[PDB]
Design a protein around this motif. Structure first.
Motif, short mmCIF file in Angstrom:
data_model
loop_
_atom_site.label_atom_id
_atom_site.label_comp_id
_atom_site.label_asym_id
_atom_site.label_seq_id
_atom_site.Cartn_x
_atom_site.Cartn_y
_atom_site.Cartn_z
N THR A 1 0.81 -1.12 -0.03
CA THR A 1 0.07 0.04 -0.06
C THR A 1 0.78 1.29 0.11
O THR A 1 1.85 1.33 1.01
N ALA A 2 0.55 1.98 -0.97
CA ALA A 2 1.27 3.55 -1.04
C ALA A 2 0.24 4.40 -0.74
O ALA A 2 -0.86 4.40 -1.41
N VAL A 3 0.33 5.46 0.14
CA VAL A 3 -0.55 6.39 0.33
C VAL A 3 0.04 7.82 0.00
O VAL A 3 0.74 8.24 0.88
N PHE B 1 4.19 4.05 2.80
CA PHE B 1 4.54 2.83 1.98
C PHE B 1 4.72 1.83 2.89
O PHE B 1 5.44 1.86 3.80
N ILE B 2 3.75 0.89 3.02
CA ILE B 2 3.65 -0.28 3.67
C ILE B 2 3.94 -1.67 2.84
O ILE B 2 3.01 -1.73 1.72
N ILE B 3 4.60 -2.56 3.17
CA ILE B 3 4.64 -3.86 2.61
C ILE B 3 4.56 -4.77 3.85
O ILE B 3 5.19 -4.73 4.98
N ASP C 1 7.68 -0.41 6.72
CA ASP C 1 6.76 0.52 6.69
C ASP C 1 7.61 1.89 6.75
O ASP C 1 8.79 2.22 7.39
N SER C 2 7.16 2.71 5.72
CA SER C 2 7.89 3.95 5.30
C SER C 2 8.08 4.84 6.74
O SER C 2 9.20 5.31 6.92
N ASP D 1 0.33 -4.06 11.55
CA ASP D 1 0.69 -3.57 10.27
C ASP D 1 -0.76 -3.63 9.66
O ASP D 1 -1.66 -4.60 9.62
N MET D 2 -1.18 -2.50 8.85
CA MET D 2 -2.20 -2.26 8.08
C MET D 2 -1.96 -3.49 6.83
O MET D 2 -0.96 -3.21 5.89
N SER D 3 -2.91 -4.31 6.68
CA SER D 3 -3.00 -5.05 5.35
C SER D 3 -4.21 -4.78 4.57
O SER D 3 -5.20 -3.95 5.18
N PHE D 4 -4.88 -5.65 3.73
CA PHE D 4 -6.15 -5.50 3.04
C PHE D 4 -6.68 -7.04 2.85
O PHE D 4 -5.79 -7.87 2.36
N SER D 5 -7.96 -6.79 2.42
CA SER D 5 -8.56 -8.14 1.98
C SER D 5 -8.78 -8.20 0.69
O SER D 5 -8.07 -7.54 -0.30
#
Ligand code: NI
Ligand code: NI
Ligand code: NI
Ligand code: NI
Ligand code: NI
Ligand code: NI
Lengths: 9, 277, 100
Positions: B10-12, B22-24, B37-38, C54-58
């Protein structure tokens, strides 16, 4: 392990 | 067994700042094991399961630099899409990317994924053949055309058929004790008055891994009830999962209802009903 | 962005007993945009040391995250999760139920 490439959009 | 390796990215974009968030997160099956985590004090690729701590610092150095490199690509792509859609910089947007491999019991690849979403709606996705793409509007059509021209499909197909499968095999061996296990659920029914002539019956499943589970309720001799209160399967925080299913029944006719619990660790379902103290 | 409103569950890791330390979980799922503020409260006061996953998604692109903290249930103390999100006019407070 992560991918080397992401698509260039 | 069916096993999967998946990465969720996810990039926001931030209006006012220049670098997006930026999160992986990395997952084998339902078990998360890496994170980037960025907005960390020092943004590194970090362990999230103890069994991945069996990798030497070269693994962590390569994965930190690749995460950092991915963040720079996702900053650019977010800027590209700003122009595609003719949007302004003072508002936030997100790019999400899932990819990874499903492998079967023999350990061979069943499905690979490489799919993206802009603002939480389908953007472009790699097809099951791992050779063509699906676009969803004018902007993803451009992206798709770019990717056809550089043969992006064969670069992703290469990852998903090779390293993704081989890395998944290594992780299943490092974390064999926690990843190749089935903890069956433990189950009970609770009883809660809901009105004068009525009662809420709740069928609990607890302490199970992996996450996939099914709970049914029925009035005995009748087909299963769809009229059911469910919660999303949720993490206990210790590596197992929890769920309940509830139903409202007449006061006095509680024992005419039956809960069943299905899980990969149960050769036969559990069969429970309300048992008065 | 459609805007999806958070589903919140507040629950203990283990079945609660008065006096026995435990872990209190706030599970927030199926929301969009990803920006969210989660606070765990004891007697309406902010619990300081709260672990954020940590934030993930579905599979439908919807986001999810877990907050948790150590706690010892007592027959008097009250626990809750308060969530702020753009889908909601007001922050939403979901109180802990000792039988979920
Ligand atoms: Ni920094
Ligand atoms: Ni779109
Ligand atoms: Ni090539
Ligand atoms: Ni051991
Ligand atoms: Ni905030
Ligand atoms: Ni903890």
């Amino acid at each position: 392990a992560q991918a080397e490439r992401t698509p260039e959009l | 067994s069916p096993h999967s390796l998946r990465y969720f990215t996810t990039a926001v974009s931030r209006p006012g700042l220049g670098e997006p968030r930026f999160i992986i997160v990395g997952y084998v099956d339902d078990t998360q094991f890496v994170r980037f985590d960025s907005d960390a004090e020092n943004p590194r690729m970090e362990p999230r399961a103890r069994w991945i701590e069996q990798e030497g610092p070269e693994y962590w150095e390569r994965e930190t630099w690749k995460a950092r490199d991915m963040g720079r690509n996702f900053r650019v792509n977010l800027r590209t899409l700003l122009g595609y859609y003719n949007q302004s910089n003072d508002e936030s947007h997100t790019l999400q990317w899932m990819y990874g491999c499903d492998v079967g019991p023999d350990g061979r690849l069943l499905r690979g994924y490489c799919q993206e979403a802009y603002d939480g709606q389908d953007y472009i996705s790699l097809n099951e053949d791992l050779r063509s793409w699906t676009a969803n509007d004018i902007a993803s059509q451009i992206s798709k055309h770019k990717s056809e021209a550089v043969d992006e499909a064969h670069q992703q197909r290469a990852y998903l058929q090779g390293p993704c499968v081989e890395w998944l095999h290594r992780y299943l061996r490092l974390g064999n004790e926690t990843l190749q296990r089935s903890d069956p659920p433990k189950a009970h029914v609770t009883h809660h008055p809901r009105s004068e002539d009525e009662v809420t019956l709740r069928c609990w499943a607890l302490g199970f891994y992996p996450a996939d589970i099914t709970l049914t309720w029925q009035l005995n001799g009748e087909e299963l009830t769809q009229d059911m209160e469910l919660v999303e399967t949720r993490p206990a925080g210790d590596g197992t999962f929890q769920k309940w299913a509830a139903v409202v029944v007449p006061l006095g006719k509680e024992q005419y209802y039956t809960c069943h619990v299905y899980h990969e660790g149960l050769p036969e379902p559990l069969t429970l009903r309300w048992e008065p103290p | 962005m459609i805007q999806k409103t958070p589903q919140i569950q507040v629950y203990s890791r283990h079945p609660p007993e008065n006096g026995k330390p435990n872990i209190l979980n706030c599970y927030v799922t199926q929301f969009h945009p990803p920006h969210i503020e989660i606070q765990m409260l004891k007697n309406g006061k902010k619990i300081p040391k709260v672990e954020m996953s940590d934030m993930s998604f579905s599979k439908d692109w919807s986001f999810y995250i877990l907050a948790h903290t150590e706690f010892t249930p007592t027959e008097t103390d009250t626990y809750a999760c308060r969530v702020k999100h753009d889908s909601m006019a007001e922050p939403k407070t979901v109180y802990w139920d000792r039988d979920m």
